[PDB]
Amino acid sequence: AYLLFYTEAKVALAVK
Amino acid sequence: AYLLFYTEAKVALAVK
Amino acid sequence: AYLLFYTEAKVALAVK
Amino acid sequence: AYLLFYTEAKVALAVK
Amino acid sequence: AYLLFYTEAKVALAVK
Amino acid sequence: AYLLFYTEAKVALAVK
Amino acid sequence: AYLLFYTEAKVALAVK
Amino acid sequence: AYLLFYTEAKVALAVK
Amino acid sequence: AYLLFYTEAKVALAVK
Amino acid sequence: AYLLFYTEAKVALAVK
Amino acid sequence: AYLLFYTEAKVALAVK
Amino acid sequence: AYLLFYTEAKVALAVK
Ligand SMILES: [Cl-]
Ligand SMILES: [Cl-]
> Which residue, among G15, E16, D7, has the nearest Cα to J16 in the 3D structure?
E16
Where chain A is broken, by preceding residue (C–N > 2.5 Å)?
8
> Which residue, among J7, I13, G14, has the nearest Cα to L16 in the 3D structure?
I13
**C-beta of residue A3 within 8 angstroms of C-beta of residue C12:** yes
Interface of D with B (CB under 8 A): 7, 9-11
Chain E residues close to J2, C-beta within 8 Å: 4-6, 14
Q: What is the DSSP string of D1-16?
A: -EEEEE----BEEEE-
Give dist(CA E12, CA E16) in Å, integer.
Answer: 12
Experimental method: X-ray
- Which residues, other chains included, contact F7 with Cβ-Cβ below 8 Å and sequence gap of 6+? A5, A11, E1, E3, E15
Give dist(CA E16, CA D10) in Å, integer.
Answer: 19
* Long-range CB contacts for residues K2-10, cutoff 8 Å, separation at least 24: K2/H12, K2/H13, K2/H14, K2/H15, K3/G13, K3/H3, K3/H12, K3/H13, K3/H14, K3/H15, K5/J7, K5/J9, K5/J10, K5/J11, K6/J9, K7/J9, K10/G15
Give, as residue ranges, everything with CB less than 5 Å from ion ligand 2: L 7
Amino acid identity, position I16: K
Give dist(CA K16, CA H10) in Å, integer.
Answer: 17
Query: Quick check: do J and F touch, 3+ CB pairs under 8 A?
Result: yes
Give dist(CA A3, CA D6) in Å, integer.
Answer: 15
Note the residue count of chain B. Answer: 16
Q: What is the resolution of this structure in A?
A: 1.9
Beta-sheet strands, E only, within chain L: 2-7, 11-15
Amino acid identity, position F5: F
- Rounded to a whole number, what is the distance in Å from the CA of K15 to chain J's nearest CA? 14
**C-beta of residue L2 within 8 angstroms of C-beta of residue J12:** yes
Cα angle, residue E15 at apex, residues I1 and F6 outer, rounded to 5°: 90
Q: Which of C4, C7, C13 is the best residue to mutate to test the A interface, defined by the most A CB atoms within 10 Å of its own CB?
A: C13
